Symmetry: D2
Amino acid sequence: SIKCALDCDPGHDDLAMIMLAVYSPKLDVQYISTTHGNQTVNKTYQNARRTLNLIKRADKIPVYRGYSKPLTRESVACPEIHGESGLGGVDWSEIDRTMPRNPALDILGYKDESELRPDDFFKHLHRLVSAAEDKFDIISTGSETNIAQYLLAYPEDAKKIRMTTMAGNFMIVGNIMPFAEFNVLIDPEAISNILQSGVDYTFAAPLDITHTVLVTEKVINDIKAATEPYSPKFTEMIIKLLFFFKDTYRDVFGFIDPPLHDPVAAFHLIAPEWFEHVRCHVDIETKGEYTYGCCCTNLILKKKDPTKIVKPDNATVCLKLKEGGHDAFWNQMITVWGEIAKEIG
Amino acid sequence: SIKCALDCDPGHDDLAMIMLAVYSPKLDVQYISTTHGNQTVNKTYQNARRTLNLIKRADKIPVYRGYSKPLTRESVASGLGGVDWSEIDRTMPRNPALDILGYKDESELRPDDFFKHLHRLVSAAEDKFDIISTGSETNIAQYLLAYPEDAKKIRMTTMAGNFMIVGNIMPFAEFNVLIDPEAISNILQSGVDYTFAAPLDITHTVLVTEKVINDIKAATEPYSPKFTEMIIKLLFFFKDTYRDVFGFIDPPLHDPVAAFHLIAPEWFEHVRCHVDIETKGEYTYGCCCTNLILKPTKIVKPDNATVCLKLKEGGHDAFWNQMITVWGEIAKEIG
Amino acid sequence: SIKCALDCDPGHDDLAMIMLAVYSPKLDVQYISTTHGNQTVNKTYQNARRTLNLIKRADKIPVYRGYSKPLTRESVASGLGGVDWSEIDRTMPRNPALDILGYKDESELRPDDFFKHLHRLVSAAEDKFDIISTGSETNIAQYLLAYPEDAKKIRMTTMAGNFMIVGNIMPFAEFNVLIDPEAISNILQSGVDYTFAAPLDITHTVLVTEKVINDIKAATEPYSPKFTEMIIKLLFFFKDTYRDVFGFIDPPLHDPVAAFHLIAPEWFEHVRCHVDIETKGEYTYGCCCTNLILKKKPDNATVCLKLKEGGHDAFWNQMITVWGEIAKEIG
Amino acid sequence: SIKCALDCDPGHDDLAMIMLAVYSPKLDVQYISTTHGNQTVNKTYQNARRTLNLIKRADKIPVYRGYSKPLTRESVACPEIHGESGLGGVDWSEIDRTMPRNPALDILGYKDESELRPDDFFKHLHRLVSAAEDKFDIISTGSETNIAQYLLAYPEDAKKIRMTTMAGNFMIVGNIMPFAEFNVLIDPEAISNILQSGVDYTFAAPLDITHTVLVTEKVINDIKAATEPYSPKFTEMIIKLLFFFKDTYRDVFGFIDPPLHDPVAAFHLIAPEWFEHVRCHVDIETKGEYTYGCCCTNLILKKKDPTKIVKPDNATVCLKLKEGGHDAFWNQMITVWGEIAKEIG
Ligand SMILES: OC[C@H]1O[C@H](O)[C@H](O)[C@@H]1O
Ligand SMILES: OC[C@H]1O[C@H](O)[C@H](O)[C@@H]1O
Ligand SMILES: OC[C@H]1O[C@H](O)[C@H](O)[C@@H]1O
Ligand SMILES: OC[C@H]1O[C@H](O)[C@H](O)[C@@H]1O
Ligand SMILES: [Ca+2]
Ligand SMILES: [Ca+2]
Ligand SMILES: [Ca+2]
Ligand SMILES: [Ca+2]
């Protein structure tokens, strides 16, 4: 079993990722840290805890509320995709009202949530990094501000951190900006810092991959088949969240079926075998006026003139799923949804 | 018939574009102006004249040798490999441009030579004068700096940029834009009526297949086997690198597509939009940035270009029949 | 008395500033936080504690070791040359910060340690809590990123920048700004009440002349000759490079001037203006850009361009009196 | 006698520079080319010709109308200093009405001025560059766009061009922007191009020097003394122009006596021996948002760590006048004003 932490900004797809990571027996989630991105970090905190409560885990997994804005830029949310709440599609009154105390507070010695501070997670992560036999796994699927901040406070830990991310676009264009992907552009300095720090970094789920991991009619019916027998209430919840995500992806980006981005990065930690991988140098544009967040690589230059590479590698890039990859991913995701529905009843 | 000028950096693609434009009865080429690219503007001059001589037109069309480097950056400089050009070079007629300029020979050619000829054409035009541009766009930027009042009477039709797909020589940008993005940025702000007629979006689907090669042979081999051999080699010179570097099974032909746009616009999708050219980006200069991906109350910066993202149905076939018919007529004249 | 904290990168100048702030009865130093500069934040930690120990205060004031590098750029890293510190190091009392934090020893110090202490001070303040900042301003930028709602209740008084004269380590920019301009840019946008109290504009006219040196000796040599010797060497360590590189006959003392501003603001000219920090410039990052040159976007700082008349003398009498009291305590 | 051309944007101080250069026997002016800057290049054309006509030379010196805007930015004029015309202070009706035909037109084969084109000067300059035994001298005291354009058309001539300029600020702050000087900031890409091209370039008159070359009451009375005996009309003209320049320099920048910048660069070609000189690497800021046009040098680094210098020298910088320099300058300037007044009567 692999001990890991999740850094995320839920967000419908982060919701899916938490489910997979928390319930996969291959992963052992230590905590969740929320960031700014799809919404304000206060909402993404609340949304991680809602995800956990729905899956009967809100009193088991500590959740930390992290940094509210990027290193050197202004926050940019994405209600256009994820609603003003960050998890549109459903009424969360019941989940909010039955929310157990956050075990993070116990760890921190806090009476209540008003004491939560962005750097709360630091000491917990540092214990996990120290304890790790090789490297400690972080899955990051929102802005990567929190990890940048950690590394600024703990630079000596970078070499013992392994990042597995949903971020970027390489061989296809971006989404919220022409050539850049949301998670990078909202704080490119963060990812630029991380790449230079000594972290072992994997672009596990760029749009390149995530734009082929779509929530089709076939997926929706497999979900209902795995869940409706055990928990109609849970079916209703997860379907509505996915339909809301679909509708905005259609109205905003023309997509017929929406991409379920973030679980794919958890899937990479669960089962790396399903992914193509290439080592390269990734530069994050920070100076560009219209192109900040662009992930610019030396892949062309290796292919052209291989033995003249100036810059050393600083990342793994996953451009495609290997054969059977899409199937492997959905079976793992739908099995988790089926187990969740069992626990809920 | 449509009077026009060609600005280009031949270049095998540009060679194909000159052929189409010069031999199309729909177009009336007034001159050709060459620019820098992978090859020095001196070579691209020589290559335009080689193209013209091969097609029995070197003594009809004036060719100008333009600027050797970008507005504010460094160049990245035969330029028509695949072929022995000794015969073409040796039988080269005098460049009619020299007569117009009063020059004894070619060593007197200056980058701004084209200016007064273009200004006469712009003045004479009833609406706008058509320029087809398929290399760096430095020359046109320079012209507009010398003649700002003419921008409003210039219509540009270009091979440049990439919009819904990634770039080529840099991750998100296309060669012609990145080699001088300030040029295109200037032009877009100037009042020029500007059409991205042949971005990679379109040109990456205009590929030299087995079917194209045999149609070429069919149109050319009866009349000029030498010319068949030549045009195939030129089209396949960069084939291996296009495969191993950029994944193509069959290599693209970019620049003719922009001449095709002036010949027959009706084969192209078209959308008016605001294009920003990245100039500040370290790794992303030359990017053509639009909101085309997006389907509020946000201040819309006004349109400054037409973007052609795809060929309409039958467009690829319309293009090749026009291109291959030209190659067929050329091969007739050569024998 | 005015409660305040010092953020600094000692540094001979910062050493002088700590002395003034700690021994002035007008100021009540709550803690010192160290930052990166020409020396690593580990050394600047050690140097703040050395300053405190020398002045018989290392067991009174908590010192925090802060961030080791800028927000988004690379560091440019003893830091108090001129002196043998073996005695001071060996007699160093436990850092009271450790007691506050529950740490056994100094290896457990973390850059964000100061945060909760500062937040208590900000909350407790009736209007705003005073920070004097005289190195890179990374620590304060980090704090504000963790605690954005506190910006409105923080008053900064800094040694940083250059406005009507050129810079020092770069043509148009001053060390403290250029080493992390994103930090100061952040702070200026945050809501902090910010004063450029001691730009080069002022500090380049606060020079260690023969007259200053003899006044120092007069105030100190009667009580502590070894302290006289120490403080002169520290003040003249960088003399040769200040002459050969930057033209000064007598070298400047920058950072005390910012503590002096909190002690006695009335000696300074002041103007409210909009300051833009260059971050995009290749050769000009750290430039503090205003329209101050012109006599014909909302204000975000106070700028102090010159000392009022008698200001130089007010400053030295305060500085030299502190050195005289220190020398008394040392003997 | 030294053959040279003037590139300028008159402008009250350019007016003074033309006077000095044209009437100094040490200099042989081949032509004047006007640029954008203190005003639109059409006005600076008219203003060069007005200068020439006033000094009985409008039919002797060809004037070219050059480029109207910078290489890659939008024009910025300076009416705040120089009036909407570019030469406020005086009524120019008489000068305009008695303006002889521009000899440039004869050189170009043009019937009239509507045929003037920005690249007109090119062929004339190229003949002068070819004919020069070493290098051909250009004095440049406005935007340097025209010379950048020339070099883009004629790159092989750069090595045979010597520039002597009024531009920049090095050890003091700028004027129209905090850290940069008008002539550089209005087109920094131009100067950046020129510095990289192979031109032999001298910053002969930065603000460093020009801010100490002031039009005092002592200068004004010396002017009147040298001119009023021979031409009261000319005295009236040159005084009014200087007083207008003074008043705006006071209202705009608080200067009591205004700096007469541009003549100082002509003075450098007349008598270099009055100037300090240092060779260094000058970088022009082009990327800075608030600091474009800044002249950033490696002078600090040679002083600090001398034998590590990376970047090769690309300019001469004149930081101060040598002793007697200010006197030498005014005697030369006031003698010219005195000779002008003689010819006018
Ligand atoms: O571009 C994909 C990222 O932004 C989307 O909003 C998802 O949350 C994902 O993390
Ligand atoms: O980017 C495609 C362009 O570059 C190629 O070299 C062709 O000439 C074409 O104009
Ligand atoms: O540039 C002035 C600053 O740098 C110096 O090194 C001093 O520490 C001062 O705070
Ligand atoms: O900054 C000085 C320059 O601009 C001024 O306006 C002068 O004309 C001079 O050429
Ligand atoms: Ca997410
Ligand atoms: Ca081309
Ligand atoms: Ca300091
Ligand atoms: Ca001028």
